[PDB]
């Protein structure tokens, strides 16, 4: 499975430097050269550069020429940005990906990205969530079915990610989108519905990270 | 540098039907050999973008072949002929004829739909939280369409306002519904007051509010 997967979210000071990592699986590291990019809402997706990681020689966006300094290590077949001097406008998620070519048309193109990882840029200090059930009862069924989930409470900065039973239960999942609280710390609810005749057999426990605190909770979530 | 300009909307379509979303250039994109370095992406809600044309009109590996590309040296088509559900998401140009590589600003695509009520469930806060002074009261409304709703918490019928907020996911890749929640916030001094809590849920699928409430501790 060619694949790359990005190191997880981040908090940094202004004026800091962080530094991300992509690690390719599946092929050759050196065969493929290595792009970043940014995304930021209503601000579309900006290319930074590449790595040649082959010859250890990058090219750069001259928007971000200053900013961000590629390196690869061929021994882990890992790929590294470095985003130097930060400001708020750097808060943003940045994704690697793999260029290809095609010899027989010509084409070049992204064919396999990263997972992408999230930077905030904040003098403000990192929180860990509270983690609570919302737990299954009749004012949750309908049918044969029950609605349960996780409330994913007062954490800085995004995000969290939230899986169930350790990724085994996908359909019926919806994580809500984070909502900022009056306090300055963020909010959200992941949900599921299962067979309500399971909920006396089957055990949902939701897994709740926060990278940017290093912190991590499983809660059990009962009837 | 060149600059690559879309618009931020498509007009929603219904499944079965074409859409058409455009892109052009400050620049042209035709090289000498004849070829036109334009690619599409499409970034479904929550991942990465993932290509679907390059050299703007080959299709990439494992794309469908209801989706096609066009255009001159300066304006593109992406052309989806029959839309499906899982081509919701925001969909994106990128020219790659020369350094630096330039993106449009995305298009998003919204998916039309039957009208369908939401599923409406509610959550009494959890012991756990309330030892520690707050009480979440979460309301969800699951798979409706239109996205439009309103959620009225109502507090021993009371009508509650300035201490909820709400959130909505976007549109499902299988079934082009959304769903929302609603959380009221309360300290637990104001929570033990009060037995009631009900959610009022309004909307087009439903001939009239549905109610959803439990009394504190039972
Ligand atoms: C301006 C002229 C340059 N043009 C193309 C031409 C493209 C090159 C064609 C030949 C390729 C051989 C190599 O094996 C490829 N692999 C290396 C390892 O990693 C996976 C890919 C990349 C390769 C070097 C391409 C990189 C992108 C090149 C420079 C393209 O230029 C840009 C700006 O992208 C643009 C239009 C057509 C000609």
């Known amino acids: 499975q060619v694949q790359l997967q990005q190191s997880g979210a981040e908090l940094a000071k202004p004026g800091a430097s962080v530094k991300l990592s992509c690690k390719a699986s599946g092929y050759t590291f050196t065969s493929n050269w290595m792009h970043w990019v940014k995304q930021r809402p209503g601000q579309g997706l900006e290319w930074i550069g590449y790595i040649n990681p082959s010859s250890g020689y990058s090219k750069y966006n001259q928007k971000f020429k200053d900013k961000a300094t590629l390196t690869a290590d061929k021994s882990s077949s890992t790929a590294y940005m470095q985003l130097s001097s930060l400001t708020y406008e750097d808060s943003a998620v940045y994704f690697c990906?793999?260029?290809?070519?095609?010899?027989?048309?010509?084409?070049?193109?992204?064919?396999?990205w990263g997972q992408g990882t999230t930077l905030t840029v904040s003098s403000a200090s990192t929180k860990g969530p509270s983690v609570f059930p919302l737990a299954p009862s009749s004012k949750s069924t309908s049918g044969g079915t029950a609605a349960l989930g996780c409330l994913v409470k007062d954490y800085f900065p995004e995000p969290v990610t939230v899986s169930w039973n350790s990724g085994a239960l996908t359909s019926g999942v919806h994580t809500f989108p984070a909502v900022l609280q009056s306090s300055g710390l963020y909010s959200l609810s992941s949900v599921v519905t299962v067979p309500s005749s399971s909920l006396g057999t089957q055990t949902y426990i939701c897994n709740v990270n926060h990278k940017p605190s290093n912190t991590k909770v499983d809660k059990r979530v009962e009837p | 540098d060149i600059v690559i300009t879309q618009d931020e909307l498509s007009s929603p379509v219904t499944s079965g039907e074409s859409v058409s979303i455009s892109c052009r250039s400050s620049k042209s994109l035709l090289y000498k050999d004849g070829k036109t370095y334009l690619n599409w992406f499409l970034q479904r809600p929550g991942q990465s973008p993932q290509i679907l044309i390059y050299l703007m009109s080959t299709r990439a590996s494992g794309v469908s072949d209801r989706f096609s590309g066009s255009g001159s040296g300066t304006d593109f088509t992406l052309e989806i002929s029959r839309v499906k559900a899982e081509d919701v998401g925001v969909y994106y140009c990128?020219?790659?004829?020369?350094?630096?590589?330039?993106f449009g600003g995305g298009t998003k695509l919204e998916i039309k739909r039957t009208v369908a009520a939401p599923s409406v469930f509610i959550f009494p806060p959890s012991d756990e939280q309330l030892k520690s002074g707050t009480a979440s009261v979460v309301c969800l409304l699951n798979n409706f369409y239109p996205r439009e709703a309103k959620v009225q918490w109502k507090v021993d019928n009371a009508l509650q306002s300035g201490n909820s907020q709400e959130s909505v996911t976007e549109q499902d890749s299988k079934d082009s519904t959304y769903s929302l929640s609603s959380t009221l916030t309360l300290s637990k001094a104001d929570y033990e007051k009060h037995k009631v809590y009900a959610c009022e849920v309004t909307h087009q699928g439903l001939s009239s509010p549905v109610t959803k409430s439990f009394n504190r501790g039972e």
């Open positions: 990906a793999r260029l290809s070519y095609y010899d027989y048309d010509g084409g070049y193109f992204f064919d396999f």
């Open positions: 990128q020219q790659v004829v020369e350094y630096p590589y330039t």
